mmCIF file with all atom_site columns, C-alpha atoms in Angstrom:
data_model
loop_
_atom_site.group_PDB
_atom_site.id
_atom_site.type_symbol
_atom_site.label_atom_id
_atom_site.label_alt_id
_atom_site.label_comp_id
_atom_site.label_asym_id
_atom_site.label_entity_id
_atom_site.label_seq_id
_atom_site.pdbx_PDB_ins_code
_atom_site.Cartn_x
_atom_site.Cartn_y
_atom_site.Cartn_z
_atom_site.occupancy
_atom_site.B_iso_or_equiv
_atom_site.pdbx_formal_charge
_atom_site.auth_seq_id
_atom_site.auth_comp_id
_atom_site.auth_asym_id
_atom_site.auth_atom_id
_atom_site.pdbx_PDB_model_num
ATOM 1  C CA . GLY A 1 1  ? 162.272 138.025 128.051 1.00 46.26 ? 1  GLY A CA 1
ATOM 2  C CA . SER A 1 2  ? 162.542 134.236 127.834 1.00 44.97 ? 2  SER A CA 1
ATOM 3  C CA . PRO A 1 3  ? 166.035 133.152 126.790 1.00 43.84 ? 3  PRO A CA 1
ATOM 4  C CA . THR A 1 4  ? 166.069 129.392 126.233 1.00 46.17 ? 4  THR A CA 1
ATOM 5  C CA . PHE A 1 5  ? 167.727 126.714 124.114 1.00 46.86 ? 5  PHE A CA 1
ATOM 6  C CA . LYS A 1 6  ? 166.500 125.873 120.599 1.00 47.43 ? 6  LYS A CA 1
ATOM 7  C CA . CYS A 1 7  ? 166.430 128.561 117.932 1.00 49.27 ? 7  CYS A CA 1
ATOM 8  C CA . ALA A 1 8  ? 163.645 130.953 118.904 1.00 49.67 ? 8  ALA A CA 1
ATOM 9  C CA . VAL A 1 9  ? 162.542 134.486 118.108 1.00 52.81 ? 9  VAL A CA 1
ATOM 10 C CA . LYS A 1 10 ? 160.609 137.371 119.596 1.00 53.03 ? 10 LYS A CA 1
ATOM 11 C CA . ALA A 1 11 ? 157.710 138.513 117.398 1.00 49.90 ? 11 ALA A CA 1
ATOM 12 C CA . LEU A 1 12 ? 158.126 142.241 117.003 1.00 49.34 ? 12 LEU A CA 1
ATOM 13 C CA . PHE A 1 13 ? 154.869 142.671 115.110 1.00 45.99 ? 13 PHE A CA 1
ATOM 14 C CA . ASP A 1 14 ? 151.356 141.429 115.933 1.00 44.12 ? 14 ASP A CA 1
ATOM 15 C CA . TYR A 1 15 ? 149.579 138.649 114.049 1.00 45.19 ? 15 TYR A CA 1
ATOM 16 C CA . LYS A 1 16 ? 146.003 137.420 114.028 1.00 44.46 ? 16 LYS A CA 1
ATOM 17 C CA . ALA A 1 17 ? 145.445 133.776 113.103 1.00 42.52 ? 17 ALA A CA 1
ATOM 18 C CA . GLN A 1 18 ? 145.330 132.015 116.411 1.00 41.76 ? 18 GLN A CA 1
ATOM 19 C CA . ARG A 1 19 ? 145.217 128.708 114.572 1.00 42.28 ? 19 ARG A CA 1
ATOM 20 C CA . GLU A 1 20 ? 145.340 128.803 110.777 1.00 44.22 ? 20 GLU A CA 1
ATOM 21 C CA . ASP A 1 21 ? 148.735 127.178 110.327 1.00 43.78 ? 21 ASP A CA 1
ATOM 22 C CA . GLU A 1 22 ? 149.819 130.621 111.396 1.00 47.34 ? 22 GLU A CA 1
ATOM 23 C CA . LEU A 1 23 ? 149.064 132.105 114.918 1.00 46.82 ? 23 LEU A CA 1
ATOM 24 C CA . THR A 1 24 ? 147.756 135.343 116.357 1.00 48.69 ? 24 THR A CA 1
ATOM 25 C CA . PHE A 1 25 ? 150.867 135.508 118.368 1.00 50.18 ? 25 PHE A CA 1
ATOM 26 C CA . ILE A 1 26 ? 151.378 139.070 119.588 1.00 49.51 ? 26 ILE A CA 1
ATOM 27 C CA . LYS A 1 27 ? 154.449 141.241 119.776 1.00 50.03 ? 27 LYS A CA 1
ATOM 28 C CA . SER A 1 28 ? 156.737 139.691 122.345 1.00 52.67 ? 28 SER A CA 1
ATOM 29 C CA . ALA A 1 29 ? 155.636 136.164 121.547 1.00 52.26 ? 29 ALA A CA 1
ATOM 30 C CA . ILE A 1 30 ? 158.445 133.624 121.676 1.00 49.66 ? 30 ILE A CA 1
ATOM 31 C CA . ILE A 1 31 ? 158.476 130.691 119.261 1.00 52.22 ? 31 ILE A CA 1
ATOM 32 C CA . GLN A 1 32 ? 160.888 127.688 119.331 1.00 51.40 ? 32 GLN A CA 1
ATOM 33 C CA . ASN A 1 33 ? 162.553 125.530 116.682 1.00 52.95 ? 33 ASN A CA 1
ATOM 34 C CA . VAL A 1 34 ? 162.532 128.010 113.890 1.00 57.34 ? 34 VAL A CA 1
ATOM 35 C CA . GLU A 1 35 ? 163.706 128.081 110.272 1.00 59.40 ? 35 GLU A CA 1
ATOM 36 C CA . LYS A 1 36 ? 162.601 130.328 107.372 1.00 63.04 ? 36 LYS A CA 1
ATOM 37 C CA . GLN A 1 37 ? 161.052 128.263 104.605 1.00 65.39 ? 37 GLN A CA 1
ATOM 38 C CA . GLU A 1 38 ? 161.389 128.829 100.841 1.00 66.51 ? 38 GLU A CA 1
ATOM 39 C CA . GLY A 1 39 ? 159.266 131.991 100.702 1.00 66.06 ? 39 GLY A CA 1
ATOM 40 C CA . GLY A 1 40 ? 160.151 133.994 103.795 1.00 65.60 ? 40 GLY A CA 1
ATOM 41 C CA . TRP A 1 41 ? 157.949 132.222 106.344 1.00 67.23 ? 41 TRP A CA 1
ATOM 42 C CA . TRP A 1 42 ? 159.028 130.700 109.611 1.00 65.24 ? 42 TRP A CA 1
ATOM 43 C CA . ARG A 1 43 ? 157.993 127.532 111.488 1.00 63.92 ? 43 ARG A CA 1
ATOM 44 C CA . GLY A 1 44 ? 158.088 126.616 115.215 1.00 64.38 ? 44 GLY A CA 1
ATOM 45 C CA . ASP A 1 45 ? 155.715 125.862 118.129 1.00 66.60 ? 45 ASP A CA 1
ATOM 46 C CA . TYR A 1 46 ? 153.729 128.597 119.915 1.00 65.12 ? 46 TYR A CA 1
ATOM 47 C CA . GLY A 1 47 ? 151.118 127.554 122.489 1.00 65.48 ? 47 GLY A CA 1
ATOM 48 C CA . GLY A 1 48 ? 149.346 124.183 122.250 1.00 67.29 ? 48 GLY A CA 1
ATOM 49 C CA . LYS A 1 49 ? 150.340 124.070 118.577 1.00 66.59 ? 49 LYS A CA 1
ATOM 50 C CA . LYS A 1 50 ? 153.525 122.748 117.017 1.00 65.61 ? 50 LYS A CA 1
ATOM 51 C CA . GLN A 1 51 ? 155.304 124.323 114.053 1.00 64.03 ? 51 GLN A CA 1
ATOM 52 C CA . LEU A 1 52 ? 152.785 126.695 112.522 1.00 62.06 ? 52 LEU A CA 1
ATOM 53 C CA . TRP A 1 53 ? 153.844 129.769 110.495 1.00 59.12 ? 53 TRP A CA 1
ATOM 54 C CA . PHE A 1 54 ? 155.104 133.267 111.043 1.00 58.79 ? 54 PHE A CA 1
ATOM 55 C CA . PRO A 1 55 ? 156.276 135.900 108.507 1.00 56.66 ? 55 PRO A CA 1
ATOM 56 C CA . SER A 1 56 ? 159.917 136.680 108.035 1.00 56.08 ? 56 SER A CA 1
ATOM 57 C CA . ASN A 1 57 ? 158.572 140.157 107.718 1.00 57.23 ? 57 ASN A CA 1
ATOM 58 C CA . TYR A 1 58 ? 157.156 140.073 111.208 1.00 59.29 ? 58 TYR A CA 1
ATOM 59 C CA . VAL A 1 59 ? 159.576 137.932 113.279 1.00 59.80 ? 59 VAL A CA 1
ATOM 60 C CA . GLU A 1 60 ? 163.302 138.212 113.915 1.00 57.83 ? 60 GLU A CA 1
ATOM 61 C CA . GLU A 1 61 ? 165.604 135.495 115.302 1.00 60.21 ? 61 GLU A CA 1
ATOM 62 C CA . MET A 1 62 ? 166.329 137.166 118.644 1.00 60.58 ? 62 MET A CA 1
ATOM 63 C CA . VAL A 1 63 ? 167.979 140.489 117.895 1.00 61.76 ? 63 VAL A CA 1
ATOM 64 C CA . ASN A 1 64 ? 169.450 140.211 121.342 1.00 60.19 ? 64 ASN A CA 1
ATOM 65 C CA . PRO A 1 65 ? 172.331 137.697 121.732 1.00 61.99 ? 65 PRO A CA 1
ATOM 66 C CA . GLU A 1 66 ? 173.639 136.682 125.135 1.00 61.03 ? 66 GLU A CA 1
ATOM 67 C CA . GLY A 1 67 ? 171.962 133.989 127.242 1.00 60.57 ? 67 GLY A CA 1
ATOM 68 C CA . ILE A 1 68 ? 172.209 132.394 130.702 1.00 61.52 ? 68 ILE A CA 1
ATOM 69 C CA . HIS A 1 69 ? 171.778 128.764 131.779 1.00 65.26 ? 69 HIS A CA 1
ATOM 70 C CA . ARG A 1 70 ? 169.240 127.693 134.408 1.00 66.75 ? 70 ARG A CA 1
ATOM 71 C CA . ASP A 1 71 ? 170.010 124.769 136.706 1.00 67.29 ? 71 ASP A CA 1
#
């Protein structure tokens, strides 16, 4: 996928906001700088946006450990 620094995730479910403070990110989307907020909602940039929202019912903080370093 896209293993990179920062705490990211890999949307397993599909959303449909596109830009409502939440995004229409689709399954496989990768968001960065994440952290569930009092309610079960996550933040983090995805696209030209920066820290919108994604369910803790839809996303999952990378259920695949491991990771390599570029150059």
